[PDB]
Design an enzyme around this catalytic site. Structure first.
Site, PDB file in Angstrom:
ATOM      1  N   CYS A  88       0.854  -1.180   0.000  1.00  0.00           N
ATOM      2  CA  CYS A  88       0.000   0.000   0.000  1.00  0.00           C
ATOM      3  C   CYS A  88       0.893   1.234   0.000  1.00  0.00           C
ATOM      4  O   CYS A  88       1.856   1.307   0.775  1.00  0.00           O
ATOM      5  CB  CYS A  88      -0.938  -0.022   1.205  1.00  0.00           C
ATOM      6  SG  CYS A  88      -1.688   1.534   1.632  1.00  0.00           S
ATOM      7  N   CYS A 251      -3.998   6.938  -4.265  1.00  0.00           N
ATOM      8  CA  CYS A 251      -3.658   5.523  -4.139  1.00  0.00           C
ATOM      9  C   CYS A 251      -2.307   5.217  -4.764  1.00  0.00           C
ATOM     10  O   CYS A 251      -2.196   5.117  -5.986  1.00  0.00           O
ATOM     11  CB  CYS A 251      -4.742   4.630  -4.754  1.00  0.00           C
ATOM     12  SG  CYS A 251      -4.341   2.843  -4.716  1.00  0.00           S
TER      13      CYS A 251
END
Ligand code: PRO
Ligand code: PRO
Lengths: 331, 331
Positions: A88, A251
């Protein structure tokens, strides 16, 4: 006197996307991070809902568990309201800020650097520090690549053109207007259900495969693009996964994946930089600082840059008789 | 080194509904709580979004600011993601737990009692304490009353039968199936817009009036009832206000208002107890421990009982260069 368990959690946001970073109360056994993550799923999944579900989190929250590492400064178990992603972007930026600003790592130079053992590979985080403050972090994400474009069957819509790339997780990229929406703030209670089905459908027809042990061979996240609102911005997107969790940032790992698509499509060359816009209007920047070979896919080496900020320093409390200690949601 | 401001915030949940209780960093001037609340709205509204919007809160969060009081142990400024309600059930239960378990008040007896100066009146909180732990709290809410039922025009629906009562705030009570929905978890992304319009529409046709200085003369919250799921439960409801905030608890002040309706409708007598169910399945219990006269409405004295639990003990941090220090939302 009133606590059964106590956790030292430090919060950050990264272009708006939270990372609840836990620094105490979790002993985990394992040779590497993939083993330690499995040992977490078995004994400790309750911590994950107690920390990111309500009332200690919310529908969209995110967590990272610091654990030791022989091959790095630390390992990191990423977790969200649904499960555990292999990598992530924003959480790594947030871990690097905490790791420095709290004096866990030696502050140094203009950049103080951290090597992290993550499920999808070793990940370098470079933090620019002014005084004590981390002003931005550059994540040298794991090698990302393009897997292919596909004509999948989306019920009620016909056949959609769809890209599939890996930037630490596999992503379904698809233009929003192709599925009848625009990614702006107002379309969110419609963007979540659409993007969610786009993950179910995509994983039935398309198959993916990453050669690395522990990297899950399914598309775990959906990314829907549209025209950005700001002039600096090259592209807008919203990333949606799990049971409806929505990335408030552009993101990192998905942006990495998009760029790896645009690289194979030739649209971007090595050394070029891309600017991504979240549904919030916040932005990242990715440079293609290199190329390498993953299995036998051609892979970019993407460098995501942004900034994260400590927002909370908490002692998370599990009170004695709390019927709801484990966490709940209603989405 | 990295902080511009720091707040001591202690979280609770009350049958699932959070209260972020702030204990440091807010000096407020004023003769009483209504003045101190206005002084808060002027200089300090930024604290309210920094603490209940994202990333430090979320779409549904709630806050209470402890301030001094000459006429009570403390005063309380209730606040949410939209504004400042005159009273709130679950936050008072949560303030009483913190006030005791943290040793701010002398723990005593089986019950240790707190008098609180709230916008809608002085409010007694009785906490049952076992050892150090508060096992439940009984709130002697302010006098509640029935204002009337009304036939209002709801576009796309015709004419709806609607009750309007005050339990510390004025409420629009209306059966969910009357407006074409059932209050269960699945109807939430439809229950929010409906209930929200029900507040706009209701405040155009109906007028309300509370004689007390500072009590706002508008219906601020919507309550939609349905058949409960549990056998203990007398009624289910969801309370929705502001820009879409949804009570995860059976809502103390609204439950108070409902009971005051059922009292005037004779369905409940003095001394009877009612059990309310939230959309989460959690419950409160209200006894009608008395009656009195508010202006010239006949008013019950309701006693809400439930329990709250500390879930977090935080140092909330406003970092130096955080573009998003003030808080954001996307609903
Ligand atoms: O910034 C990122 O890459 C993370 C991955 C999951 C949600 N957003
Ligand atoms: O429990 C209560 O009464 C509060 C009032 C506003 C939201 N829920």
């Amino acid at each position: 006197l009133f606590a059964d368990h106590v956790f030292h959690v430090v919060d950050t946001h990264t272009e708006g996307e939270p990372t609840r970073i836990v620094l105490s109360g979790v002993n985990v056994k394992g040779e590497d991070i993939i083993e330690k993550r499995e040992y977490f799923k078995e004994h400790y999944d309750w911590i994950r809902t107690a920390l990111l579900h309500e009332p200690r989190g919310h529908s969209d929250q995110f967590g990272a568990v610091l654990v030791p590492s022989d091959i790095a400064d630390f390992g990191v178990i990423y977790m969200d309201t649904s499960g555990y992603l292999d990598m992530c972007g924003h959480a790594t930026m947030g871990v690097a800020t905490v790791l420095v600003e709290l004096g866990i790592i030696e502050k140094k130079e203009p950049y103080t650097t951290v090597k992290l053992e993550t499920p999808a590979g070793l990940v370098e985080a470079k933090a620019k520090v002014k005084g004590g403050v981390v002003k931005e972090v550059t994540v040298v994400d794991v090698p990302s690549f393009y897997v292919g474009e596909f004509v999948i069957e989306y019920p009620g819509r016909g056949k959609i053109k769809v890209d599939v790339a890996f930037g630490g997780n596999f992503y379904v990229i698809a233009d929003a207007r192709d599925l009848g929406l625009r990614v702006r703030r107002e379309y969110i209670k419609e963007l979540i259900p659409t993007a969610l089905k786009l993950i179910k459908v995509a994983n039935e027809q398309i198959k993916v495969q990453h050669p690395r042990k522990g990297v899950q061979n399914r598309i775990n996240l959906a990314m829907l693009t549209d025209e950005p609102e700001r002039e600096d911005s090259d592209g807008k997107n919203v990333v949606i996964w799990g049971e409806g969790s929505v990335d408030r940032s552009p993101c990192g790992t998905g942006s990495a994946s998009r760029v790896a698509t645009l690289y194979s499509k030739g649209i971007l060359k090595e050394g070029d930089i891309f600017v991504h816009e979240s549904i919030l209007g916040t932005q990242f920047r990715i440079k293609i600082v290199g190329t390498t070979k993953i299995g036998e896919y051609t892979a970019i080496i993407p460098e995501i840059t942004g900034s994260a900020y400590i927002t909370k320093i908490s002692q998370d409390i599990i009170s004695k008789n709390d019927p709801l200690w484990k966490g709940f949601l209603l989405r």
